[PDB]
Symmetry: C3
Subunit: 332 residues, 3 copies
Amino acid sequence: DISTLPRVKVDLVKPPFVHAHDQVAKTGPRVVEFTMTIEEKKLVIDREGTEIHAMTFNGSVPGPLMVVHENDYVELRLINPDTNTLLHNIDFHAATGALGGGALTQVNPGEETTLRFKATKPGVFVYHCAPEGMVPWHVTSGMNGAIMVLPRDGLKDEKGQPLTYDKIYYVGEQDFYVPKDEAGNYKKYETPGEAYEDAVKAMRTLTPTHIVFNGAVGALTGDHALTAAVGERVLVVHSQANRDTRPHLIGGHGDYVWATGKFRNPPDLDQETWLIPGGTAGAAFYTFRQPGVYAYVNHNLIEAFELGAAGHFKVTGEWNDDLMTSVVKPAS
Amino acid sequence: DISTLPRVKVDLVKPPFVHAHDQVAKTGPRVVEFTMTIEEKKLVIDREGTEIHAMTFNGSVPGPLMVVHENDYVELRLINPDTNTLLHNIDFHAATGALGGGALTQVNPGEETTLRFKATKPGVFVYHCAPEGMVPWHVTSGMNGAIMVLPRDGLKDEKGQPLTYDKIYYVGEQDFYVPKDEAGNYKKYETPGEAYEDAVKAMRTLTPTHIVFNGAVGALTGDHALTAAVGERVLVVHSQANRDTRPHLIGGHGDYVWATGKFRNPPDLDQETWLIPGGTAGAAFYTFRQPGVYAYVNHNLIEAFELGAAGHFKVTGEWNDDLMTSVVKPAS
Amino acid sequence: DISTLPRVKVDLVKPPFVHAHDQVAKTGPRVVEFTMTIEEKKLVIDREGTEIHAMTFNGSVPGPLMVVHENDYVELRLINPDTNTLLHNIDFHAATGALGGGALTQVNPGEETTLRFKATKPGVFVYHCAPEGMVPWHVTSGMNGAIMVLPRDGLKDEKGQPLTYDKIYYVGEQDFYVPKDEAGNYKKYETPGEAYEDAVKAMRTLTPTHIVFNGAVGALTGDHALTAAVGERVLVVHSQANRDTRPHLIGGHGDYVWATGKFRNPPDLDQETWLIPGGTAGAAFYTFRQPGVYAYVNHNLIEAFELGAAGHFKVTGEWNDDLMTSVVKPAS
Ligand SMILES: O=N[O-]
Ligand SMILES: O=N[O-]
Ligand SMILES: O=N[O-]
Ligand SMILES: [Cu+2]
Ligand SMILES: [Cu+2]
Ligand SMILES: [Cu+2]
Ligand SMILES: [Cu+2]
Ligand SMILES: [Cu+2]
Ligand SMILES: [Cu+2]
């Protein structure tokens, strides 16, 4: 009887940060209560000042990472305020039935709904909006995120030994398809209905105009760079709701990688680059061994360095000259 | 001596259905005899009525799924009737030597040939036409299918326990590259020779105009939706002869997935989405747990919902409110 | 103390050949000394005579395959002669720290540098040039290669038994993005600075104009076809620094495949086609069973047969009619 289970309310945080949770379950199964509010808003996505009408869960692209344990129940209250103009819903790849919840969560502006589902499979999973007849538009406008369902005894390596992370970050990679005129400049629109056929035409090229981490070119750089220290074990969760991506930590590795994100499978070891299929979330564990700046990129380098799919880690600590050294510094 | 083996003639069926076979081999190795007749025909591939000149094995896109056991011999009689205009052949990725049989099966219109090969590796494998100098044209005009070579003791899970399916479906995903004029309308042609350079130019964009299951937008929907019942174990074989695809069952999972299709490898567990590389067939096993409509899609959602790469399952049975429930239905 | 280790100087060879090495380490850890000289040069990449300004390590696209054992130290002397015009550096995906060495190896023309790093993870790894603000231009102009770090006890199969290769080849697959005018003809340029914005614009299409093995259409064909004999165990290392590829040996298989190239993981068995993500190197082991010509291709067949991503193996020996035979040769 689900009514006899403990309930716990989670307060979500903005990516790339992740709400507090326990890796190993410290309670029995619980109903884990989340609330998200849909926000349609203008977002500046690049250095040129290109501004799109984003569709978001909780004001961010991506939506927040939700974290539960296997065989918990996830209960989501989804709010569509009357300040929005569109119908939205939510589909969880973690859930079973009703198009992942999409069939049960259609909310017009001024409506709310509450969905409960049992998290029966451990892994990281995409969630996204999926309104009938409009699915790729919503998803490619930013309306996606991920949920992590941890095994009750936490993560394990290929030999079944515990893998415990010290820090976790969530990188949502978003492909935008900003409509272009024939000269190649981005077009702007006065209503969603007036933008829609042009959105569809831009999507049908299959060529994103921008591919960004955390919602904008340069979002995970500067004062918003990811951080770690030498010796820290970091889990990076990475999702892409629509298009394949190939994450790579420049100067590092994926020590243990679940490229398709499902923790019942043994991880791949020592990866340089891993492929996360469109519509999947993956997770990579790394222990930093050197200080300095790392670039975390989609290793289609055009996507990384021309279209925006790159962020930085700033790592503190001691340099290890055994692992790498300049023997002769650049000279004539 | 192959002449001392039993011979069994198979009568093929139209995808997404699969000819009758045994999962566990009930005989010793056999020569399994198949016949396919090449048919060049006009096919309407979308709701707008876009009509292409398809090149098919046995009148269908994809070609039929052939099913044998490891170390059977496959004997194929390939017929190119004099009503066709082109040279064709057949390459099996399951076979060893002679470009998969392609070098030995070149048939002009009015010719036939018979190829025999030993199915030495268990898995699902693409087959396709591959005439010298014209390969991608034939393949992207529909001339591809798959063959499943089952282990003699049937499929096994990651622990080596039997996995037995109740139903099997074959989804062939086809990328078409319909030539477009500068305004973006599809062009039409009076002969294959007159279409060819325009075909090549359209292929060189690397951007399909259509991506469809079972040969047309909406082919696996409505009265042609895939079916199952709650509790049924279903194997979905999915092939793509030219381009990567990322299947996803909306509302379900791949309980056991061989994303690159080869059964000597342990399956990946609990997949949301899996990547099948171009030129590969993969196979996903799922036990349905909820009734209703599921969408089976390529999870590039643009490819799914704008370009045609989506089908439906209709699943009968009892709803499980423990797994998913609406707690508060959408309301003001 | 690294000064007490043996030093061994390697003389590199042109791809697809690989310098001589031992599969099983016959010495303790060593400092393995390599020298590469950067060469900017004009290269004819297709049958039409399209000529690009290539940027190379050691005069070749790809750069040479370096081969060391796990926990060796790699010491590279990188030379940028004053005959070149650009700044270059080198990033090794095998290395840990300083952006894979990129931060420590920036060499102006007329400069050289020496980097040492410990090869701590066994696998095949990409290396490439990565100058700040210009990364995809250098990489997509040919400035990439791979390094193989073998386990000290050589390669092993999925059961931990030795896999020993008789021959090894390195296939570098390169995506070029040759700028096109509006009519679609390739443009030509009088300086790198004058080409750069057009390079960027061509890259931003995400649609390569050429995809080639060993630096040009047809490079691994004819007198430069790869060779083997029936019964020979061949390892093919394949890298792609920027874009996903899906290798396939037409008429063969990948008996044992490390699609993401890392030897601590068990190989995938019996692959028809495998996906190597952009920014990764993979390795496939095959024992030839039939003589004749094989085509080794990217199984996006458009990329293979229209854009250049295809090479040949010529295999000597005895035909096995048990594995494949023409029963009835093509006839009326
Ligand atoms: O085929 N693009 O996901
Ligand atoms: O690179 N397309 O398969
Ligand atoms: O998304 N191309 O690597
Ligand atoms: Cu929405
Ligand atoms: Cu989805
Ligand atoms: Cu054909
Ligand atoms: Cu093929
Ligand atoms: Cu360079
Ligand atoms: Cu790199």
